[PDB]
Amino acid sequence: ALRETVVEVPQVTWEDIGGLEDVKRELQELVQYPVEHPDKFLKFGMTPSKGVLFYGPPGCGKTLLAKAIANECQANFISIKGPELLTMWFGESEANVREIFDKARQAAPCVLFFDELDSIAKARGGNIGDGGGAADRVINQILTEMDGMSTKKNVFIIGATNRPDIIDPAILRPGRLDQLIYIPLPDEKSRVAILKANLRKSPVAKDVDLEFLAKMTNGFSGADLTEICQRACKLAIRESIESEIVPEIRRDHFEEAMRFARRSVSDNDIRKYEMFAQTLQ
Amino acid sequence: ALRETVVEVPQVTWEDIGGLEDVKRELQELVQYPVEHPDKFLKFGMTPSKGVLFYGPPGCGKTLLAKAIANECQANFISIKGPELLTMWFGESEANVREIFDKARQAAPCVLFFDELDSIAKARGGNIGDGGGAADRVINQILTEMDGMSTKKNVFIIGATNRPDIIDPAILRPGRLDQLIYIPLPDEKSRVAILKANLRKSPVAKDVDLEFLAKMTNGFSGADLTEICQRACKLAIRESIESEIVPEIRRDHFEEAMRFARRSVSDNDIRKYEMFAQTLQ
Amino acid sequence: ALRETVVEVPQVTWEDIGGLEDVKRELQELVQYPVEHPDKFLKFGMTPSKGVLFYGPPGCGKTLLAKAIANECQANFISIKGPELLTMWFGESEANVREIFDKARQAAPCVLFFDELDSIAKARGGNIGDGGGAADRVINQILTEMDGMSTKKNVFIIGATNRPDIIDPAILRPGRLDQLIYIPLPDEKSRVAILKANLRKSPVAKDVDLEFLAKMTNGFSGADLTEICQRACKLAIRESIESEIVPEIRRDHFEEAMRFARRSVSDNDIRKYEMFAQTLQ
Amino acid sequence: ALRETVVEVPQVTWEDIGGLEDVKRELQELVQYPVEHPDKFLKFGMTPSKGVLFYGPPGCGKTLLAKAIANECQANFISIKGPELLTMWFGESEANVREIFDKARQAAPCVLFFDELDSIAKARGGNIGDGGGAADRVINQILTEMDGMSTKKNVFIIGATNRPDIIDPAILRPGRLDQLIYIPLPDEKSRVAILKANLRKSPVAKDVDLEFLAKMTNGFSGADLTEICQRACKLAIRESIESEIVPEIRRDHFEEAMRFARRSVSDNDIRKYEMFAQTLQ
Amino acid sequence: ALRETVVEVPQVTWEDIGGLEDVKRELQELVQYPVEHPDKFLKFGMTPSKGVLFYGPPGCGKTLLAKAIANECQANFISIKGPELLTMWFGESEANVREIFDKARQAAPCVLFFDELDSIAKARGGNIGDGGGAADRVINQILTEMDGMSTKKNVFIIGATNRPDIIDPAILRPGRLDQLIYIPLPDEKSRVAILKANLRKSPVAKDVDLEFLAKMTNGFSGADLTEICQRACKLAIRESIESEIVPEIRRDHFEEAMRFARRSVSDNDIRKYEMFAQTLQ
Amino acid sequence: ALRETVVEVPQVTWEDIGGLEDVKRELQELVQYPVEHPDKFLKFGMTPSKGVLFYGPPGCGKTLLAKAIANECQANFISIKGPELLTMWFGESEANVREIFDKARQAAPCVLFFDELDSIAKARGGNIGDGGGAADRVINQILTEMDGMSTKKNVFIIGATNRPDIIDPAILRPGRLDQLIYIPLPDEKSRVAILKANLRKSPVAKDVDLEFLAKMTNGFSGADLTEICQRACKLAIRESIESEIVPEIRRDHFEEAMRFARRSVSDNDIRKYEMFAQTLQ
Amino acid sequence: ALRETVVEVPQVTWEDIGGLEDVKRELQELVQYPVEHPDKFLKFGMTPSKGVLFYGPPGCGKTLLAKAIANECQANFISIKGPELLTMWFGESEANVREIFDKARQAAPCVLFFDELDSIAKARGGNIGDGGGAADRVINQILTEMDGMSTKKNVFIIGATNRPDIIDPAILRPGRLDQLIYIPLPDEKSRVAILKANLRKSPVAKDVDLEFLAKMTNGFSGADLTEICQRACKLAIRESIESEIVPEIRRDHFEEAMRFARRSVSDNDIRKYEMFAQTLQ
Ligand SMILES: Nc1ncnc2c1ncn2[C@@H]1O[C@H](COP(=O)(O)OP(=O)(O)O)[C@@H](O)[C@H]1O
Ligand SMILES: Nc1ncnc2c1ncn2[C@@H]1O[C@H](COP(=O)(O)OP(=O)(O)O)[C@@H](O)[C@H]1O
Ligand SMILES: Nc1ncnc2c1ncn2[C@@H]1O[C@H](COP(=O)(O)OP(=O)(O)O)[C@@H](O)[C@H]1O
């Protein structure tokens, strides 16, 4: 029953991504440089990498990064998510992976982006599991489709997962997703950037202090912070539409939005990433 | 063997819903405002949400809310319930979820409402379960059909469950059912409203004291309260048809109706929802 | 391999049912009143119920009731029993439930009556069971067919079970078999009515004291009582055909019939029903 | 792969059956009286029974009874045995049960006799068993075919089993095999009858004392007793053919036949039947 | 994949069978007498038996007996062995049993001989086993084909097994293989006969003392004895062909043949047969 | 997916086999003598054997024997190996065993040679195993094809296994692979023969002392010894081709070849064969 | 769903392989000598080997060697990797192995190279496993396709595994992958060679000391060393492109590259290989 493969031009750019300067640069070095300086790669000899795996807690910009990089390269973007993998897994129809790769090859230059890579693992038991090993029909197909996919087309693959412990190791061997990259929770400074980025296209009241909001937040992932802004907006809109029946999103809106701030990632989980992040890096 | 997908116009409005003022407002803000004020959403930038998940104990108005909102927006309403999901699960026919989504897309503006979202979970063991993870072929389909369903059609998805502990987490990721909303048991005041709402289209004897009946009921859910009225009616009808072979539903009818008042939700369960409600919110 | 669906006109009336006055009334209030007084239901607003679940020990008239009600309403009666459900279960042919529901809809006004509701439950392990939850492909089908079956046709559904502990709870949700009704063992007075009813069409000797027979019997179900009469008859018939090679069924025939009186329901079981009957009501 | 259904006229009569006077009478009262005195059954009202279940240890005449009764009523006899049921079970072809019932219906008046009723139960594990409950596809089909088989045809069903503890209880509900009948090991007097019956068509030497042989035998079933006579004959025949290369089966033949007398039923088993016989009656 | 059913005329006669005089006689009385003296069977009334089950340790002449008796009756002989039964069991092709029975019916007068009857039992686990009871699809088929096979054709069925503990008991019921016969290890005298028999068609040196060889051998079965002779021959042959590059099988050949004498059956096993033989007879 | 059955003329003769004089003789007595002296077999009566099973540790000449014998008899040779059997096992295509047997029958006189007989047993768990008994669909076929294969064709069957403990016992019954033969590790003298045989077609330097090499080697199987020669050759060739850019394989080559001498069979294993060899012989 | 079999000419030569002089030589002796000196192999008699199994820790040049050897012989190279094997395993399509072997046969002279030979073993549980033995449908097919593949075509098979403990032993029998070869972690000297080889086609700054880097690295595999160079390059490139918006990869680049050196193989694993390497050699 496989959904339809949608190529698209990534709407998002580096400006919408708070922080992660280091990876932005590193990403460019992995896709820009090989295409825009093929001369320098031929000069020094070394040939580029097929793909990258982002791992990290949820809501930290694994997707923004995959899209921004596509958009920066002015390239096409295909996004295969968890449920789509799982459909092929449940329906035994992993042959469609071929189709996905076709559509990316034909849409070259293209970043093909497998989000929620771990979702089959999870689906068969995850942490504990069933009988066999990390291999599964669908991811396995991805890996062939990746072995057979000539380095010299213009398709860049990016995987993302927030449960790298359960990912099949074969994904990481040379010639596949070689570059492990950890996208961590946002720090002190980064949370500021993330707020600014999230409010770039918004009428932020002058007084509202984000540098402070950033001090107020921790196990707060980008997603968590975006959630705050949105509640603040929804408050300003409801506060606007109220008065008529005057629009700048202001202090007391953020204040009252803060009354419902959650943290998606708990400390245990965070700890767990550092463990993953230690061996994995 | 899939049943026939029935589009319909929701018969029920906010007046038939006792209490829940806060959510009613919140719901409007999620569906009315984006459609009737696209200008304000484009002004502040933020784009609306695809869907909502109501969780709560049974008989508290999760359906009334999904219908009232559709009716308020003067929109179509499709309802897929537990047994329908289970059919596709037993018959391995989840491809029909595509059909359901077509039917909703084609009937846009539409609220597509998946009640008893947890019923496959229960069916495969629930709390304890089988080998694998939360994923199952049918919900997974819903999820694809929801990824592939352009935000810009006019289809609004609402899930309902009373066993949110067993719902697949993927349902809650961004771009799906983002808005968790808890529909709790009705409180002191609310029970009054619910009784009034339930008796709006009825000859209530003047003396009959609802504010009191409300004090009399606790772990009483909206369903439970309705049940009382109905017994009161059935008593008045039986008491009417009796005299001939004089119609206003009166004090002693409710009194004798009360002699059979149950509570659908037990305190343990209630406690469990607060647990769910704590982490989940 | 599904048997052939037989619509029929119920041969049996209230006179054949001993005792249960309360439920007889209640049953009428559930099917008569909505049809023969649609005006009063529209006046008070409340809309009628789709169906009813009788539970209780075996041999207490859960069938008699389902039939007599159909006959009173001068309606058609379809009976699906255990073995029929089991056939669909074993043959994986639950699509036939559809056909049954068609045949009912087409023979409207009709009481469709699913006796032995629990029989698949028993078949898969019952009290202890297999892996999964209460759902099974066949009952589930009944539930879809019932969700999809417009309230406004003229089909009234009635389930019966004597193992309501193993019934799938979904069967009891609103819009399904909402009305739980307990048909208990016959009491003191009831036993007399049941003997009278069973002998209505019989030459009972004048002396024969039933009010006494009633005192003699306890965990005696209607079925058990019928069994006595029958042995009494068989005794009179054998006693008759004897003399020739003089017909009124008399004292000493009942006396000698009593020499083989069993009780189908044991006290433990009975106790169990009260437990079921406590939570369930 | 189902065997061919053979209608036949029962060769055996009451004379060939030793003892069991009580049941012979009872059997007649259950099949003769309703057919040859429909007037008396209509007079007293009571309607006849569809069938009967003999249970008992093996070799006690459960079969002879089923045949004699058919032959007395000058009726047709169909015999389905264990291996035939099992064939349908293994081959999943229970739909043939229909065919059998057709053949019986078409050959009416008929006794349809299911011997070794328990043989599926045994095959699946019996005493201990598999996962599920007493129901199985094949017996179940017998049960439908019997519900759907109008009381008013002329087909009388008889089941036999020596392991009633493992029979599905549904077989015993009203309208099915209502009449449980225990066919016990032969007693003191009966053993004499059984010997006489078995030798009715034989040249028994005048001196040979059976009343004594009867004293000599206990856990001896009809079958076991027959076995003795046969060894006696085989001895006389071998003793006859011997002399030529003079025929009356005599004392010393029985004497030397007794040197190999077995008892098919052991005391534990017998005990077990009394347990079954206690609750079951 | 079922092998081809071969009818044949039994090459072997009573002379080739050492000992077992008692059963030879008994076998004749079961097959000769009914056919060559139908008058005497009709005179005394008793009707003959359908078949016989030989059980006992391996290499004791269960096959010779089955053949010799066919040959004596100048009849055809079909031999179905273990691997052939197993083929039907693995292949789920027990319907071929029908074909075997046809071929036998058509070749009448015939002894149909199912050797290694226990071989499916063994194959599913034997002594310990799998879930279910003694029934299996293949043996079951044999049983039906035996119930349906009219007594009045001329086909005589013989089973053999050396693991009667795992045989299905149904095979022993009346109308099937009624005659249990134990073929025990050969005794003192028998071993002599067996040697003579086995040497009937051989140049045995005059001096060679078999009555002694017989004293020398115990847990020796016919097969074991045969094995000796064979080594003795092989010695003589090799001793013959040697001299040229003088033929009477002599003392020192048996002597040196004895240096390799085994016993196929061990005392434990033997003990086990006596146990089987005790209850079974 | 069965491989293609290849008839061939065995290239190898007794000269290429070191040691095993006793078996070579024995083998001849089992195939030569019956064919080249049918008179003597008819004279003494005894009829020849259908086949032979060689068991022993690996690399001891089980194959060489099977071939040499075929070649001596100037006969055809078919070799089915482990993976071929396993293919039929995995693919459920044991019907091909028929085809193999045809092809052998048609190429008669022929030695059909089933090497690695135990490989299915191994494949299903071996020592510990799965649920059932020794029987498996493929070996079982080989047995039928061997029962059905007339003694009087000219096909001689030889099996080989180094795990006789796990071989199905049925293979050893009379009329199948009756002759067990143990092919043990080569002893002191044998090792010399094996070296000479292995070097028969080689320029062995005069000085090189094999009788010594023989003293140096133990748990050394023929295979292991062969391996040494080969390393010696490879040394002489590399040592030859070296000098040009002089050929007799000499002392220091063997010396340096010895620096890499392994033993395929470990003492535990060897012990295990003696256990097998004890009961088995 | 099997991927497309790609013949190719190996791009890589001995120069690209650091160290392993011994095996390079040994490899040539196994493929060159038989083809380029068929005269010398015919002279000494010995016939060449079909194939080779490299086992060792990951990233040590098992692939390089397979390729370099093909390239040296100026031959074609087919690479079947793990995921391809797994595809046939999951899809039960091992018949494609035939196709692979055809394509290799048709591309002769060819080295056919099965990398990750152990990947099914792993997939079914590996170290612990499932019920059965080492055999599996796909590898088994490889083995047949290797038995049937005439020694006299020009196809040379090479396996590679880093989990030789779980490899099916049958792969190692004569006539298959006879040559076990251990490719160990690179030692002291080797690491220098590997760095040089890895930088052959690179502008290495004169000062940069590799002999030192070699001292710095241990459980460092060729892959791990490569990884260092690459980070050094990436640093020089990033450092180059930086300055414009000057190219020789220099000291401080390696220095900073060293700040992220991992070791792919841990000491436990290393230990494990020595264990494998001890028995296996
Ligand atoms: N209340 C009753 N009044 C009269 N007869 C009854 C009653 N309950 C039972 N019987 C006798 O027992 C039989 C079984 O009743 P039924 O309603 O079929 O049992 P259940 O309650 O198991 O459905 C009836 O046919 C009748 O002969
Ligand atoms: N009673 C016997 N008399 C003569 N030979 C026998 C006897 N029992 C066995 N043999 C030898 O052993 C072989 C196996 O006998 P058979 O009857 O096939 O064994 P089973 O009893 O296992 O069927 C016979 O072919 C014959 O060579
Ligand atoms: N007895 C032997 N004489 C000479 N060479 C032998 C002997 N046993 C083994 N070899 C060497 O070992 C190889 C394997 O022998 P083979 O018979 O195939 O082993 P198996 O005994 O496992 O069947 C032979 O091809 C030969 O090179």
Side-chain angles (χ1 to χ4, degrees), chain G residues 237-254:
Chain G
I237 295 164
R238 166 209 198 171
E239 230 271 311
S240 147
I241 301 168
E242 199 171 41
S243 85
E244 325 153 23
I245 326 294
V246 220
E248 318 61 35
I249 203 297
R250 72 175 173 273
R251 168 158 307 185
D252 39 298
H253 287 138
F254 277 90

Side-chain angles (χ1 to χ4, degrees), chain G residues 135-150:
Chain G
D136 64 74
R137 58 190 29 254
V138 176
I139 303 298
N140 187 77
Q141 209 53 67
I142 306 217
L143 298 192
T144 331
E145 277 313 309
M146 198 181 326
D147 286 350
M149 211 248 327
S150 191

Side-chain angles (χ1 to χ4, degrees), chain C residues 84-104:
Chain C
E84 186 151 5
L85 299 153
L86 275 163
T87 295
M88 286 174 285
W89 180 67
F90 278 120
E92 283 203 57
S93 46
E94 63 274 6
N96 282 88
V97 175
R98 177 140 208 55
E99 183 271 314
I100 296 166
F101 269 88
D102 287 341
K103 189 142 297 147

Side-chain angles (χ1 to χ4, degrees), chain D residues 28-195:
Chain D
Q28 285 182 193
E29 299 183 16
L30 279 181
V31 302
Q32 306 262 65
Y33 300 15
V35 82
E36 286 160 339
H37 300 270
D39 52 338
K40 275 98 183 169
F41 280 64
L42 281 35
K43 285 168 208 163
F44 289 106
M46 82 138 274
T47 42
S49 44
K50 304 210 55 173
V52 155
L53 202 208
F54 295 141
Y55 61 102
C60 289
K62 275 184 266 34
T63 287
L64 307 184
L65 282 176
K67 276 168 177 169
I69 190 67
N71 141 120
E72 166 89 336
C73 283
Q74 282 306 347
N76 280 320
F77 181 79
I78 303 158
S79 155
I80 286 95
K81 298 177 213 201
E84 183 153 13
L85 292 160
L86 272 170
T87 286
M88 285 171 284
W89 182 68
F90 277 122
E92 283 200 63
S93 44
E94 58 275 16
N96 285 86
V97 167
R98 175 139 205 60
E99 181 271 313
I100 300 170
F101 268 88
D102 282 345
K103 193 142 295 140
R105 205 175 284 99
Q106 155 262 73
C110 198
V111 344
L112 178 57
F113 169 63
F114 292 98
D115 170 59
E116 288 170 276
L117 253 174
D118 55 81
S119 72
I120 293 164
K122 272 209 280 275
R124 36 202 277 257
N127 355 343
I128 49 161
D130 52 333
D136 61 82
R137 60 190 29 244
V138 177
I139 305 298
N140 186 70
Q141 213 41 78
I142 303 214
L143 298 191
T144 325
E145 279 314 309
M146 198 178 332
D147 285 349
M149 211 249 323
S150 189
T151 164
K152 306 171 76 59
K153 315 282 177 155
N154 232 335
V155 171
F156 193 63
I157 306 157
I158 302 183
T161 166
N162 47 216
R163 299 270 288 92
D165 61 301
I166 48 177
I167 292 321
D168 175 5
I171 295 149
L172 317 167
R173 291 191 183 226
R176 309 211 170 110
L177 305 197
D178 290 285
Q179 321 301 305
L180 276 290
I181 295 180
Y182 174 42
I183 280 62
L185 276 109
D187 76 74
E188 297 68 72
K189 308 169 190 289
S190 292
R191 286 190 291 285
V192 183
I194 287 172
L195 285 169

